[model samples]
Target chain A: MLSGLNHLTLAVSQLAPSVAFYQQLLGMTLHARWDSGAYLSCGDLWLCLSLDPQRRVTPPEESDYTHYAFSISEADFASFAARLEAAGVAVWKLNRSEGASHYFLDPDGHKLELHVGSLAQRLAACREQPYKGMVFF
Target chain B: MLSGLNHLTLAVSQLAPSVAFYQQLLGMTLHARWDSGAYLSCGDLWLCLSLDPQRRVTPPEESDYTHYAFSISEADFASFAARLEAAGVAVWKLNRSEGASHYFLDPDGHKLELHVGSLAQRLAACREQPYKGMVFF
Candidate 1:
């Protein structure tokens, strides 16, 4: 049986900048670096940053709601938002009946998020509200 | 500070089949379902499947290295691969010195993986090998 998620790999245009962003802004520890990619650790999850020049040549318009979200404490949410803003990362604040989230794009236009609550908490909050946001099946 | 990965959302052409794939095959628990999306839990991580007509419209060519991986025990690796093959899902075997992985395309063309070892184990395996296969940074 599958135990849990091991890691996620994302294609980026530049390896160095992405590594810097993840290490400096997101505080992910750099584990290993190759010519075309780097592996970073976020808690127990591994994030692999693979360099794909072809994706940079032809970027696609990503759809809404397709994103990977990280968990943050309620106390650190504001500070993190400020840090991202300071870094010139475009930030979108999304709120629901349950909690708040910060949606932002990475340097390569990949959608990433930071939410304050756990998945269970968010689901419970969404259950109490009327469906109005983007459709999530 | 950001703690860990909370959830990953992927845009699928259809919600029902994707939900079934995650729940029935991958053994994820369906937590909530809406008209356009559904949330499934993989241990501590949440996997969200959202319906995106646009991605289905102009299907983008995703690079090979971009994928999300799930952890499986060494004991369950063979059975999981067999089950996936029996279900008619295409599986690709990727082997390193220390661990092995099965890469498969989801119904939406999004790549997903099931690996026999943790990220640490794979990283150590890759470090021991000469760069030959997919470039993982």
Candidate 2:
């Protein structure tokens, strides 16, 4: 019965660097700063980067999870790409003839995407073929 | 800067049931529908549920790895709580010293909060003492 998709909690190892990477790379506004963690808002999505020292850290090579994808105005795409390049962050643009944008990873090694149009744009294209619909908002 | 959070994508075993649950439980407006996935906007955040057969499927019990949170107005809290309880959805209300409304988990198991103030108001409290800070429109 929750109203909307709120913030997502990510267990992180390097808090400061991951924080800086998101702040600088994605332009996510700092919503709340916490001692154990920090909350960031990018567009409407809230990201909670939790720092649990006791939690065993996942090695970069052994990890399988990818970060969530975010859609931004095409206008800001270049700036974000430039920011990533300027920051010397490795970026890989996934070009597809029929799909959304490219894929990349954050400092915490979270894979993400910056797609064109909106997610709704992508979803509307899905209904035509006729398949079972998913329940989530 | 982006005004609010947009969407979070979740890995789902099936699409139809998830869509039905979200629509019936949370009243997510169907912004767009798709073949492999669907997109719904809950307030500011967008939720994407995937139906990728090839993708890794996480069991329902382990689906809480990604806990997404959002906010609602104080006036709507009681009604929201009641609706959730009636549907047998587990809702967690965290008490904050500061005046803010917060809650947890949507139909899709995403955590959300309906804080009283905007991000600025809640963030001011987080300047030094960083922890869970909630915000609304």
Candidate 3:
């Protein structure tokens, strides 16, 4: 029934700055924008940033592990991570597992990540260190 | 900072039920499962369902627009929608314009959408009936 992930919609507090964050800092191509939201693309990923007054205005808690991760090349990782820091985005956590990842937060405190790894690689890593009874299908 | 969406992690309460929802209902292949989480994939998408007690215990309000959408073929839409209904999942909303979509909630009440359209098709639809001051790039 499902093919693949089509898009991700995020409720943000401010529109212009959030648009600028993805457009200028993150290098996502802006597709369109209206009064309440903006459409942007990073490769085939469609991102919608919607302006909502009821959005979670605070940062994610320490125990909240839910997030959206974007793929990035190892060569481009350092440069882009630095760029995000220069632009004032707070780093949520440092990657310590199978991949090199930089976790950060959006303007509306949405958890986001830039990962330099793929599922194939993560599977291989899991194989190397099996978790008691790791099963694959 | 990004290329495309690599994965989406959701903090679920019950790992077994959540895994069944994605694996049985959504047809995602199970890559692995540990004590606290499961890894699944649908085509190029990597999904992580982590067991976390700190996750939002309640359903999202009407004003919250944050969501994740999966792509499905037009031919497969109706059958899948029925499958979801037979499985007792609730439909959140119906499609109004542009694309054929079925908005639904997962086991953890996280908003999920199955859309049968592409960005190109949406852009063309927008061109036909655009907003007050729509801008495209």
Candidate 4:
């Protein structure tokens, strides 16, 4: 049986900046770095930054809903948002869900979020105001 | 500080098949399904399949290397590969790195991998055969 999510690889145009973003801004541990790539980990999430020249050549549009959301503590949320704002990171969307979330774009236009909530809370929110045809397993 | 990866939202063209692909094929627990999206849990990973009409408009080309890798047991590798073959799932690439891995495409051309190994093993391998400018945190 599948155990868990091992890793996620993202193609980035600028390897150095992407590495810096995930390492410095996000505070993920940098395991290793090479010319074309680097390995980092955030808790159990192992992330790979692959430098690709032809990667996502077209930037993500406004409607691109795909994103990776990272969990942050409620106590750290305000400071984190401030850090992003201090760094001039672009905000893509405002919070629109059950938790305090800040939707933003990575250096490569990949959608990302810093969210303060858990699955249990999310499910509870769903139960209260469900989507059309919402069903749980 | 950012604690961990909370969730990953993927834009899928068709919601039902994508839901089935993750739920049945990947063995992820389906949390809920709605008109536009669904939530599933793969161990600690919270995966969201969002239905989007204009998402990833262009199918990933040969050079696109972005992907999500799931950890499976070494004992289950062969059987899982066989299962994928039996389903006629398209394999995007053959395994090229250490440990056993099956590189295949999901229904929507999203690159996914079933891998058998841990980060400690990967880092150990890197120490044995270091990449250019490889460094540890």
User: First chain TM-score in every candidate?
Assistant: 0.84, 0.70, 0.93, 0.93
Model 3 misplaced stretches (Cα beyond 4 Å): B95-98
Residue by residue across A1-137, what tens digits does model 3's lDDT show?
68889889998888998998889888999999988888899988989888888776766674367799999999998999899899889988877887788999988778899998888888898888977656766
The 0-to-1 C-alpha lDDT of every candidate, in the order given, reads 0.76, 0.58, 0.84, 0.85
Q: Return whichever of 2 and 3 wins on TM-score.
A: 3
Cα shift from native, residue B16, model 1 (Å): 0.8
- lDDT, model 4, position B3: 76
Between prediction 1 and prediction 2, the one with superior DockQ is 1
Per residue, candidate 4 scores C-alpha lDDT tens digits across B62-81 of 44687889999889999998
Question: What is the Cα-based TM-score of model 3?
Answer: 0.95
- Candidate 3 chain A lowest-lDDT run of ten: A56-65
List the candidates' TM-scores in order: 0.86, 0.69, 0.95, 0.95
In the range B1-137, model 3's lDDT, one tens digit per residue, is 57799899999989899999999889999989988889999888899999998865546464377889999998999899888888889766674543788888987778898888888788888888986577877
Pick out the ten consecutive residues of candidate 1 chain A with the lowest summed lDDT: A56-65
In each prediction, how many residue pairs overlap at the backbone (N, C-alpha, C within less than 3 A)? 8, 33, 0, 0
lDDT by residue (tens digit), candidate 2, B1-137: 33343346665556677787566666777765556666677765667766645334433344333345555667776786677678776655455545455465544444445555444555665554555543321
Instruction: TM-score chain B for all models.
Output: 0.81, 0.64, 0.91, 0.90
Instruction: State the displacement of the C-alpha of residue A110, model 1, in Å, after optimal TM-score superposition.
Output: 0.8
Model with the higher TM-score, candidate 1 or 3: 3
lDDT at residue B1 of model 4 (Cα atoms): 87
| Candidate 1 off by > 4 Å | A57-64, A92-97, A130-137, B57-64, B91-98, B130-137
* lDDT comparing candidate 2 with the true structure: 0.58
lDDT by residue (B38-107, candidate 1, tens digit) is 8788888788888888655222353445678888888888888878888898644455422577877677
Per-model fnat list: 0.62, 0.37, 0.83, 0.90
